Amino acid sequence: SSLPTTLDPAEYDISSETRKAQAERLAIRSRLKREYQLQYYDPSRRGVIEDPALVRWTYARSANIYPNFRPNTKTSLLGALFGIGPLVFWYYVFKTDRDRKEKLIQEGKLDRTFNISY
């Protein structure tokens, strides 16, 4: 989430060393574009091309489970607090509702007159 004004004409260097770096952005962009352009405008292709940027994108989410998370830090225990935590949370919600219901059946009847269901 953005904190101040919407960042588009704000905070930029006035044509300093960043201009050489900005020219490098188009150099790598066109390098990946030209190899895409050569493998597109031929009629004898027939088939969806690979594009390694999207293949590694799927590999980042589906795989990297046990090569990652080998330093099980205190942040993982904080994530575990959001894991087991909510499962134990409802144990003091459903039981309190049940003990409210079950006591109303035996002493001081609260059961419905037209309850043929269940």
Binding site: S1, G79, G83, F114, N115, I116, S117
Partner: protein, 604 residues
């Protein structure tokens, strides 16, 4: 006897194009004309049994087609033909038929012309089921049906991501409102076995939990209210007859229509009576505030649906269900008139969706301009433009009540607020100097447009004179306070129009005005694109990825048994790789095993 026989014909006639859709008979280009001719004769077959109702006769029919014997239950195709259900059918069929005539001119010369009418009939049928429904299950088929057919009508064009999200949020914000109706299903079975309309009118205890997160929350999903209403302006991104069908007659009723049917349940419960006005007073103003400042031809009419929707919610709070649907029946003639006549302007001057660049003068266009004059004044409290028979009876009844004064005062500002947005269609888009940006702009009169709107002009001028005069009334409170309540409703619209004429002239007729720099605009959007379109899907998807996926479902919830796999592979080395050769090492361990058996694991 003929009342029951002719009632099912209206259901049969609408299904006949669906039954004869897959090949059947060779009819190209005639199929869109076939839809128009089917509904035209369906209107005639609906007019006759309504004349039977004004005379004498009530009937609740079952088809003897129940697929349940499950635990003391029967769910047949049950059809109620009484008052609220009866009067709506010819009103809905006449409104749709004119939109079908409008669908001849708009969406013309397109490859998806035949596929367009496929969903429009099902959109009518599901509503016709929901209107006639006598079960709560039969009520669900239509109430979900209108909500599911809207996806294939709002998101009809497969263009940008905005209309796709508009079609998404049409169900997303509906399904939050669905929870109440599923709670309505669950409470009814456990407490009153049958859960059909015949049963639930009898044996009615004072229960607050039933329509708390129930019928009132069902009225927030369908027919948007203050709880959930970001999907109101987004629905206009599709074609114009779809918007002419939804928020005028179909989508606008489905929320309140439930509460009108459940009227004896609301009669006794005073907590529900208060919360209907509490979630009905904010709906009249807060949504209507976004009509003036946000400038779009379709959206001004669309934001004013919710203001009139609040008046439908006020009638629930006053405990008058008889006058509740009478407003919605005339609302079908009010806004469906407005959507197609403005939609005629949109299509004429190429492509314009903003009022800013629209300049269709009263002298420039002959027929569409006159339809807007009659239409916009009909929405305001005018003595004989059918608005008096609908809107003015709500305000006068609401003044004599035991309910909240602040809830009444909030609705009274909204009744005077009607004149300002109506003039924002007249003064801004129609009246004055033309602002249409074109080298050559042409707007031609079509034979299909004239015959459609002219027949609606009879329906818009002669609605309250026929419908409200013939329908049986129940307790009229029009007697007390003539200068404080009765005359004040019409005077507020006159004072509102005088305020609108002064505010528009101060902004437009100023030559050199110079706008200010600092502004507080909650009036512009309501900041729902910042908390409900921005933050609400963000929190659901951040909890999806930062937690759950990258912690629980892949790493931690797996870990338990990969722990035993890692332990088995580690303890494998302590037996395989251990003791590399040497008969000495193997025999030395044998001496220990005898010593354990002799002393430690003792057996004499």
């Amino acid at each position: 006897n003929m009342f029951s026989s002719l009632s099912l014909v209206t259901l049969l006639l609408l299904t006949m194009p669906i039954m004869m859709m897959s090949f059947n008979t060779y009819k190209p280009s005639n199929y869109p004309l076939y839809v128009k001719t089917a509904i035209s004769y369906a209107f005639i077959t609906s007019m006759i049994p309504t004349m039977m109702f004004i005379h004498s006769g009530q009937e609740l029919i079952i088809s003897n087609w129940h697929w349940l014997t499950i635990q003391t239950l029967k769910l047949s195709l049950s059809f109620k033909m009484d008052y609220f259900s009866m009067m709506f059918i010819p009103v809905a069929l006449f409104v749709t038929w004119s939109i079908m005539e409008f669908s001849m001119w708009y969406m013309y010369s397109d490859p998806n012309i035949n596929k367009f009418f496929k969903y429009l009939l099902l959109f009518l049928i599901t509503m016709l089921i929901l209107v006639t429904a006598n079960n709560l299950f039969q009520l669900f088929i239509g109430w979900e049906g209108v909500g599911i057919m809207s996806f294939l009508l709002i998101g009809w064009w497969y263009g940008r991501a905005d209309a796709n999200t508009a079609a998404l949020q049409a169900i997303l914000y509906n399904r939050i409102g669905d929870i109440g109706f599923i709670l309505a299903m669950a409470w009814f079975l456990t407490n009153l076995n049958t859960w059909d309309l015949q049963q639930i009118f009898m044996l009615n205890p004072s229960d607050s939990n039933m329509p708390l997160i129930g019928l009132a929350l069902a009225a927030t999903g369908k027919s948007a209210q203050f709880g959930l209403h970001p999907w109101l302006p987004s629905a206009m991104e599709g074609p114009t007859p779809v918007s002419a069908l939804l928020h005028s007659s179909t989508m606008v009723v489905a929320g309140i229509f439930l509460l009108i049917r459940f009227y004896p349940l609301t009669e006794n419960n005073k907590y529900i009576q208060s919360i209907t006005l509490c979630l009905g007073a904010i709906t009249t103003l807060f949504t209507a505030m976004c009509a003036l400042t946000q400038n779009d031809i379709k959206k001004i009419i669309a934001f004013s649906t919710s203001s009139q929707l609040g008046l439908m919610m006020v009638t629930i709070g006053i405990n008058q269900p008889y006058l509740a649907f009478l407003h919605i029946c005339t609302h079908a003639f009010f806004k469906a008139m407005l959507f197609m006549c403005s939609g005629s302007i949109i299509h004429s001057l190429n492509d314009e969706q903003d009022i800013r660049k629209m300049g269709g003068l009263f002298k420039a266009m002959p027929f569409t301009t006159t339809a807007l004059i009659v239409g916009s004044l009909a929405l305001t409290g005018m003595p004989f433009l059918t608005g008096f028979y609908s809107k003015d009876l709500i305000i006068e009844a609401a003044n004599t009540s035991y309910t909240n004064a602040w809830a009444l005062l909030m609705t009274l500002i909204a009744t005077s607020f009607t004149a300002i947005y109506s003039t924002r269609i007249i003064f801004f888009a129609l009246l004055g100097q033309p602002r249409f940006p074109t080298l050559v702009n042409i707007n031609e009169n079509n034979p299909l447009l004239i015959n459609s709107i002219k027949r609606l002009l009879i329906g818009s001028l002669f609605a309250g004179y026929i419908i409200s005069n013939n329908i049986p009334p129940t307790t009229i409170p029009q007697m007390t306070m003539p200068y404080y309540l009765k005359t004040t409703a019409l005077i507020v619209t006159i004072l509102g129009f005088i305020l609108a004429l002064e505010i528009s002239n101060m902004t437009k007729n100023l030559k050199y005005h110079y706008p200010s720099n600092a502004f507080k605009f909650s009036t512009l959007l309501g900041y729902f694109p910042t908390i409900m379109h921005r933050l609400a899907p963000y929190m659901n998807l951040s909890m999806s990825q930062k937690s759950a996926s990258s912690l629980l479902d892949l790493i931690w919830l797996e870990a338990i048994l990969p722990k035993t796999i890692s332990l088995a592979q580690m303890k494998a080395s302590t037996l395989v790789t251990n003791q590399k050769g040497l008969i000495k090492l193997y025999f030395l361990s044998f001496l220990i095993t005898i010593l354990i058996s002799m002393i430690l694991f003792n057996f004499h």
